[PDB]
Design a protein around this ligand. Sequence first.
Ligand SMILES: [Mn+2]
Ligand SMILES: [Mn+2]
Ligand code: NI
Ligand code: NI
Lengths: 133, 139
Amino acid sequence: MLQGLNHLTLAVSDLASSLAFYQQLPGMRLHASWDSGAYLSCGALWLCLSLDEQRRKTPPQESDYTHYAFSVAEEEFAGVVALLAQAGAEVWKDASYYFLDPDGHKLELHVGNLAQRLAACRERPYKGMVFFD
Amino acid sequence: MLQGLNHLTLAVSDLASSLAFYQQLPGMRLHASWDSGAYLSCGALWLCLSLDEQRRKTPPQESDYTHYAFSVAEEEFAGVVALLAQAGAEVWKDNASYYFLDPDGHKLELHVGNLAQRLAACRERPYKGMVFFDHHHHH
Ligand SMILES: [Mn+2]
Ligand SMILES: [Mn+2]
Ligand code: NI
Ligand code: NI
């Protein structure tokens, strides 16, 4: 039986460039690096960077909505966003902040879990929404 | 401070096709669905499906190595892979890991072991040019 996400692996074109970008994020931690990848963690998240020359840096309008979001407390959301604004991180769309990584992977800062989102969705459902017990 | 992965959102071309696929995985559980998306959980993972016009069934050779792996216990790895083999899930890379695609071509994986165990394995035998940053006394 599946117990959860084991690891998230992102294909990167320049490992040193990607390592600088993720090391600036508070909570991100570098455990090891080698010639074609690196191992990082962020809380329980095991993040793996994999060097891939068949990885393009893609502008956000030319990729789909697949994105990866990281948890930030409400009291610290404003701080982290200011840190990425000062760093010059490019935003790709409009309690969330959407920013890309050096290769164009769509990332997000988000406050709230799945339980708070379903509760909000109960009080105001989307079109055709069904809840399952 | 970033505390961890908040949610993983996958773009899908057929929402109903995708929910059949992910619900076939034991432990994958559906909480809500609507016209253009769904909310699922798997342990602590919050998985979100988002219906997208601009999404192709991408062949594995035409996409990069970005993939998403799910944890399975050692005693149950064979069962879950056998379940996906009988279901006909397309494999995207040879072989404690099993690499399979979802109906849109998102690269997935089942894996036994965590990052602490992989780091231990890597220190017994490192990759090319590997440098470790958690202090150890392995020789
Ligand atoms: Mn999101
Ligand atoms: Mn993997
Ligand atoms: Ni040894
Ligand atoms: Ni020591």
